[PDB]
Amino acid sequence: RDIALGSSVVSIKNQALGGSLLHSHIQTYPDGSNQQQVTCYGYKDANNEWFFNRERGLPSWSENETDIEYLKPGTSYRLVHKSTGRNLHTHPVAAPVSKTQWEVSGYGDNVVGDNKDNWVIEIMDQRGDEDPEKLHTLTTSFRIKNLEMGCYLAQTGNSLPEWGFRQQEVVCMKNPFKRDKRTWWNIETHENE
Protein backbone atom coordinates (compact mmCIF):
# COMPACT_ATOMS: atom_id res chain seq x y z
CA ARG A 1 0.00 0.00 0.00
CA ASP A 2 1.46 3.36 -1.07
CA ILE A 3 1.50 6.10 1.54
CA ALA A 4 -1.77 8.08 1.64
CA LEU A 5 -2.80 11.51 2.86
CA GLY A 6 -4.34 11.41 6.32
CA SER A 7 -4.94 7.71 6.88
CA SER A 8 -1.31 6.48 6.69
CA VAL A 9 0.45 6.62 10.07
CA VAL A 10 4.19 6.32 9.54
CA SER A 11 7.51 6.41 11.31
CA ILE A 12 10.32 8.10 9.38
CA LYS A 13 13.97 7.00 9.68
CA ASN A 14 17.11 8.98 8.88
CA GLN A 15 19.71 7.42 6.58
CA ALA A 16 23.00 8.90 7.86
CA LEU A 17 25.34 6.92 10.13
CA GLY A 18 23.50 6.53 13.45
CA GLY A 19 20.32 7.86 11.85
CA SER A 20 17.15 7.10 13.78
CA LEU A 21 13.43 7.91 14.02
CA LEU A 22 11.77 11.35 13.67
CA HIS A 23 10.23 12.06 17.05
CA SER A 24 8.39 14.59 19.18
CA HIS A 25 6.87 14.93 22.67
CA ILE A 26 5.29 17.72 24.71
CA GLN A 27 8.56 19.13 26.12
CA THR A 28 9.60 22.48 24.64
CA TYR A 29 12.88 24.17 23.72
CA PRO A 30 14.32 26.14 26.67
CA ASP A 31 15.74 28.77 24.28
CA GLY A 32 15.22 29.29 20.55
CA SER A 33 11.52 29.64 19.80
CA ASN A 34 10.41 27.88 23.03
CA GLN A 35 8.18 25.71 20.78
CA GLN A 36 7.73 21.95 21.04
CA GLN A 37 10.91 19.89 20.57
CA VAL A 38 11.46 17.67 17.53
CA THR A 39 14.20 15.03 17.88
CA CYS A 40 15.32 11.67 16.54
CA TYR A 41 14.86 8.70 18.85
CA GLY A 42 16.54 5.30 18.93
CA TYR A 43 13.63 3.10 20.03
CA LYS A 44 10.16 2.32 18.69
CA ASP A 45 7.29 4.06 20.52
CA ALA A 46 4.12 5.92 19.62
CA ASN A 47 5.88 9.30 19.74
CA ASN A 48 7.56 8.26 16.45
CA GLU A 49 4.16 8.34 14.67
CA TRP A 50 3.39 11.02 12.06
CA PHE A 51 0.78 11.45 9.35
CA PHE A 52 0.57 13.79 6.35
CA ASN A 53 -2.17 16.42 6.19
CA ARG A 54 -3.13 18.92 3.51
CA GLU A 55 -1.17 22.11 3.02
CA ARG A 56 -1.90 25.01 5.35
CA GLY A 57 -5.29 26.59 4.60
CA LEU A 58 -6.88 23.60 2.80
CA PRO A 59 -9.50 21.33 4.41
CA SER A 60 -7.99 18.99 6.98
CA TRP A 61 -8.17 15.32 6.03
CA SER A 62 -11.28 13.60 7.38
CA GLU A 63 -12.11 9.91 7.71
CA ASN A 64 -15.46 10.90 6.17
CA GLU A 65 -13.71 11.46 2.85
CA THR A 66 -14.52 8.62 0.49
CA ASP A 67 -11.63 8.86 -1.95
CA ILE A 68 -8.04 7.99 -1.12
CA GLU A 69 -5.38 10.55 -1.92
CA TYR A 70 -1.85 9.17 -2.36
CA LEU A 71 1.10 11.37 -1.47
CA LYS A 72 2.77 13.03 -4.46
CA PRO A 73 6.29 14.44 -4.65
CA GLY A 74 6.20 18.17 -5.26
CA THR A 75 2.89 18.72 -3.42
CA SER A 76 2.84 20.77 -0.19
CA TYR A 77 1.80 18.83 2.93
CA ARG A 78 1.80 19.32 6.64
CA LEU A 79 3.60 16.61 8.61
CA VAL A 80 1.61 16.10 11.82
CA HIS A 81 2.89 14.46 15.00
CA LYS A 82 0.15 11.98 15.87
CA SER A 83 0.50 11.95 19.68
CA THR A 84 0.54 15.74 20.14
CA GLY A 85 -1.21 16.92 16.92
CA ARG A 86 1.46 19.56 16.26
CA ASN A 87 2.77 20.45 12.79
CA LEU A 88 6.40 19.96 11.86
CA HIS A 89 7.60 23.55 11.68
CA THR A 90 10.67 25.66 11.01
CA HIS A 91 11.62 29.32 10.93
CA PRO A 92 14.73 31.57 10.99
CA VAL A 93 15.66 30.62 14.56
CA ALA A 94 19.11 29.12 15.21
CA ALA A 95 19.11 25.41 16.04
CA PRO A 96 20.12 24.42 19.61
CA VAL A 97 23.43 22.67 18.82
CA SER A 98 24.13 23.22 15.07
CA LYS A 99 23.97 26.98 15.41
CA THR A 100 24.41 27.63 11.68
CA GLN A 101 21.19 25.69 10.84
CA TRP A 102 17.53 26.34 11.66
CA GLU A 103 15.54 25.05 14.64
CA VAL A 104 12.79 22.52 13.83
CA SER A 105 9.79 22.44 16.19
CA GLY A 106 6.24 21.18 16.58
CA TYR A 107 3.81 24.07 16.26
CA GLY A 108 0.05 24.69 16.21
CA ASP A 109 -2.68 22.40 14.87
CA ASN A 110 -5.28 22.60 12.08
CA VAL A 111 -6.10 26.22 13.08
CA VAL A 112 -2.86 27.53 14.58
CA GLY A 113 0.09 27.83 12.24
CA ASP A 114 1.11 29.36 8.93
CA ASN A 115 2.80 28.55 5.63
CA LYS A 116 6.05 27.57 7.41
CA ASP A 117 4.18 24.32 8.15
CA ASN A 118 4.30 23.32 4.46
CA TRP A 119 6.82 20.64 3.42
CA VAL A 120 7.53 19.06 0.03
CA ILE A 121 8.82 15.53 -0.63
CA GLU A 122 11.53 14.85 -3.20
CA ILE A 123 12.19 11.21 -4.06
CA MET A 124 15.93 10.45 -4.16
CA ASP A 125 15.93 6.69 -4.67
CA GLN A 126 13.53 3.83 -5.35
CA ARG A 127 14.90 0.39 -4.91
CA GLY A 128 11.62 -1.26 -5.90
CA ASP A 129 9.76 -1.50 -9.18
CA GLU A 130 6.44 -0.01 -7.96
CA ASP A 131 5.21 3.44 -9.13
CA PRO A 132 8.42 5.50 -9.01
CA GLU A 133 6.46 8.68 -8.27
CA LYS A 134 4.78 7.29 -5.15
CA LEU A 135 6.14 6.73 -1.64
CA HIS A 136 6.62 3.10 -0.65
CA THR A 137 7.33 1.78 2.82
CA LEU A 138 11.07 1.12 3.39
CA THR A 139 12.15 1.14 -0.27
CA THR A 140 11.72 4.87 -1.10
CA SER A 141 14.42 7.33 0.05
CA PHE A 142 13.40 10.99 0.04
CA ARG A 143 14.22 14.51 1.23
CA ILE A 144 11.71 16.72 3.06
CA LYS A 145 12.04 20.40 2.07
CA ASN A 146 10.46 23.33 3.91
CA LEU A 147 8.72 25.31 1.16
CA GLU A 148 8.96 28.77 2.75
CA MET A 149 12.51 28.55 4.16
CA GLY A 150 13.97 26.43 1.34
CA CYS A 151 15.88 24.22 3.77
CA TYR A 152 15.95 20.44 4.28
CA LEU A 153 14.89 18.41 7.31
CA ALA A 154 17.98 16.72 8.77
CA GLN A 155 19.25 14.68 11.69
CA THR A 156 22.65 16.21 12.43
CA GLY A 157 24.20 13.43 14.53
CA ASN A 158 24.48 15.78 17.53
CA SER A 159 23.00 14.75 20.83
CA LEU A 160 20.76 17.28 22.59
CA PRO A 161 21.30 18.48 26.19
CA GLU A 162 19.47 16.82 29.11
CA TRP A 163 16.52 19.15 28.54
CA GLY A 164 15.86 17.18 25.29
CA PHE A 165 16.23 13.77 27.05
CA ARG A 166 19.68 13.57 25.37
CA GLN A 167 17.89 12.60 22.13
CA GLN A 168 19.20 13.46 18.62
CA GLU A 169 19.09 17.03 17.27
CA VAL A 170 16.87 17.68 14.22
CA VAL A 171 17.43 20.85 12.17
CA CYS A 172 16.52 22.37 8.84
CA MET A 173 19.76 22.49 6.81
CA LYS A 174 20.51 25.45 4.55
CA ASN A 175 21.92 24.56 1.14
CA PRO A 176 23.07 20.95 1.73
CA PHE A 177 24.58 18.86 -1.02
CA LYS A 178 21.94 16.72 -2.72
CA ARG A 179 23.48 13.39 -1.55
CA ASP A 180 23.96 14.42 2.10
CA LYS A 181 22.36 11.49 3.92
CA ARG A 182 21.63 13.61 6.99
CA THR A 183 18.78 14.91 4.77
CA TRP A 184 17.69 11.48 3.41
CA TRP A 185 14.78 9.62 5.04
CA ASN A 186 12.60 6.58 4.46
CA ILE A 187 9.26 5.36 5.77
CA GLU A 188 10.18 2.73 8.39
CA THR A 189 6.69 1.59 9.50
CA HIS A 190 3.25 2.08 7.97
CA GLU A 191 -0.20 1.46 9.48
CA ASN A 192 -3.39 2.35 7.63
CA GLU A 193 -6.93 1.77 9.04
Author numbering: 340 to 532
Quoted passage from the original study:
PMT-based O-mannosylation is an evolutionarily conserved and vital process, key for cell wall integrity and protein quality control in fungi. PMTs are divided into three subfamilies (PMT1, PMT2, and PMT4) and form functional dimers either within or across subfamilies (Akasaka-Manya et al., 2006; Girrbach and Strahl, 2003). In these structures each subunit has 11 transmembrane helices (TMHs) and two large hydrophilic loops oriented towards the ER lumen (LL): loop LL1 between TMH1 and 2 harboring a catalytic DE motif, and loop LL4 between TMH7 and 8, encompassing a so-called MIR domain, whose function remains unknown. MIR domains have a β-trefoil fold consisting of six β-hairpins arranged within a pseudo-threefold symmetry.
The high resolution of the Pmt2-MIR (1.6 Å) and Pmt3-MIR (1.9 Å) structures allowed for a detailed analysis of the respective structural properties and ligand interactions. Amino acid ranges for Pmt2-MIR are 339–401 (MIRm1), 402–466 (MIRm2) and 467–532 (MIRm3). In order to understand the role of PMT-MIR domains in protein O-mannosylation, we analyzed the Pmt2-MIR structure for specific surface properties. On the protein surface two regions reveal high sequence conservation, in the following denoted as sites α and β (residue ranges see Figure 2) in accordance with general CBM terminology. For Pmt2, H362 and H364 are fixed in a defined orientation by a complex hydrogen-bonding pattern within the strictly conserved site α in the interface between MIRm1 and MIRm3. MIRm1 site α, which is directly adjacent to the conserved L361 of the core, is completed by residues Y380, D384, N386, F504, and Q506 forming the wall of the cavity. An almost identical arrangement is found for Pmt2-MIR site β in the MIRm1-MIRm2 interface. Both cavities are filled by ligands present in the crystallization solvent (glycerol in site α [also in Pmt3] and sulfate in site β). Although Pmt2-MIR displays a pseudo-threefold symmetry typical for the β-trefoil fold classified as Type C CBMs, the analogous site γ (the third binding site present in β-trefoils) is not present in MIRm3. However, on the surface of the β11-β12 loop a two-residue insertion is present, which is specific to the PMT2 family (including Pmt2, Pmt3, and Pmt6) and human POMTs. This loop forms a surface exposed ligand-binding site in Pmt2-MIR, from now on defined as PMT2 family-specific site δ. The three residues form a trident that has picked another glycerol ligand from the solvent via hydrogen-bonding to the arginine side chain and to the backbone amides within site δ.
